Amino acid sequence: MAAEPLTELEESIETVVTTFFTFARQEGRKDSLSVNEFKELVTQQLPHLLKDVGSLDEKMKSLDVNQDSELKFNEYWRLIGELAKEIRKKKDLKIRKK
Amino acid sequence: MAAEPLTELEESIETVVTTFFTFARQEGRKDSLSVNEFKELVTQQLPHLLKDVGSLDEKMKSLDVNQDSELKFNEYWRLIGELAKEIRKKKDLKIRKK
Ligand SMILES: CC(C)c1ccc2oc3nc(N)c(C(=O)O)cc3c(=O)c2c1
Ligand SMILES: CC(C)c1ccc2oc3nc(N)c(C(=O)O)cc3c(=O)c2c1
């Protein structure tokens, strides 16, 4: 249950786990991310990527599909895809040259 | 349209796009990934992350859900979740510390 660096492509997915899981372990489950801390991370360390830092209720409901307490990686996975999808095409209509 | 470096967390998921997009551009849709080249990426530059390199069809069928011979980021999204999930708890039975 510990992410170690190996190759350039394997290190990218490892950097996202090793950087925020140090604070996510504070609440229940080691592999699960907190419901109150992920909202603060998207408005402090990840604000430029996801334009809707305040309007996160659309994804917040889609993430916790089982509805327990926190966002497990299987539940948080809905934002992991939007992380690399909104990086190049957050507004593919007005701005298309980054 | 293209992916450019940003913050520590945003740059990790951003680098994964720019590394494989250099070879994915040759096939249809720049944002979409090929069904043969992505399989070769796991058996050359990502073999240690995904322990099951031979039987890739188990995830391949879950990726191309639309059935159009093109793995868009919405289709490839299922492997992005399994990439970061099969790094710390790949074999949660025999080994649980790396
Ligand atoms: C990848 C990094 C953020 C990470 C992820 C999961 C972790 O799960 C652990 N389990 C433990 N019981 C103890 C401990 O017993 O101190 C500590 C940790 C980690 O340091 C630990 C570190
Ligand atoms: C830095 C270089 C290797 C690179 C990396 C990712 C890229 O992602 C893009 N996205 C797009 N939709 C289109 C496009 O709409 O034409 C083109 C590209 C790139 O040229 C492109 C170029």
Q: What is the 3-state secondary structure (H, E, C) of chain B?
A: CCCCCCCHHHHHHHHHHHHHHHHHCCCCCCCCECCCHHHHHHCCCCCCCCCCCCCCHHHHHHHCCCCCCCECHHHHHHHHHHHHHCCCCCCCCCCCCC
Is the minimum CB–CB distance between B23 and chain A shorter than 8 Å? no
Q: Per-domain residue ranges for chain A?
A: 1-98
- Distance, in Å, from the CA atom of A55 to the CA atom of A23, rounded to the nearest integer, reads 23
Residues of B with CB below 8 A from A49's CB? Answer: 6-7, 9-10
The one-character DSSP state at A25 is: T
User: Among A30, A31, A32, A41, which is best to mutate for testing ligand 1, by the most ligand atoms less than 8 A from CB?
Assistant: A30
CB proximity under 8 Å: B 76-95 to A: 77, 80-81, 83-85, 87-89, 92
| Residue closest to A20 by CA, chosen among B8, B88, B82 | B8
- The answer to whether B30 and B1 are in contact (CB under 8 A) is yes
- Sign of torsion, CA A64 A67 A71 A77? negative
Residue A50 CA: distances (Å) to CA of A46, A90, B74 = 7, 7, 17
Q: Quick one: which ligand is closest to A18's CA? A: 1
- Distance, in Å, from the CA atom of A96 to the CA atom of B30, rounded to the nearest integer, reads 13
CATH code, residues B1-98: 1.10.238.10
- The answer to whether A22 and B61 are in contact (CB under 8 A) is no
Find out whether the beta carbon of B5 lies less than 6 Å from any atom of ligand 2. Answer: no
The one-character DSSP state at A71 is: B
- The answer to whether A59 and A76 are in contact (CB under 8 A) is no
- Kind and range of the H or E element at A21? helix A8-24
Q: Tell me, rounded to whole angstroms, the distance of Cα B6 from its chain centroid.
A: 21
Biggest alpha carbon distance in chain B? 43
Residues of B with CB below 8 A from A25's CB? Answer: none
Burial grade of B64 (CB within 10 A; 0-12, 13-18, 19 or more) = middle
The one-character DSSP state at A57 is: H
Q: Tell me, rounded to whole angstroms, the distance of Cα B77 from its chain centroid.
A: 8
Indicate the Cα dihedral angle B54, A15, B34, B46, nearest 10°: -30
| Residue closest to B50 by CA, chosen among A50, A9, A68 | A9
Amino acid code (one letter) for B52: D
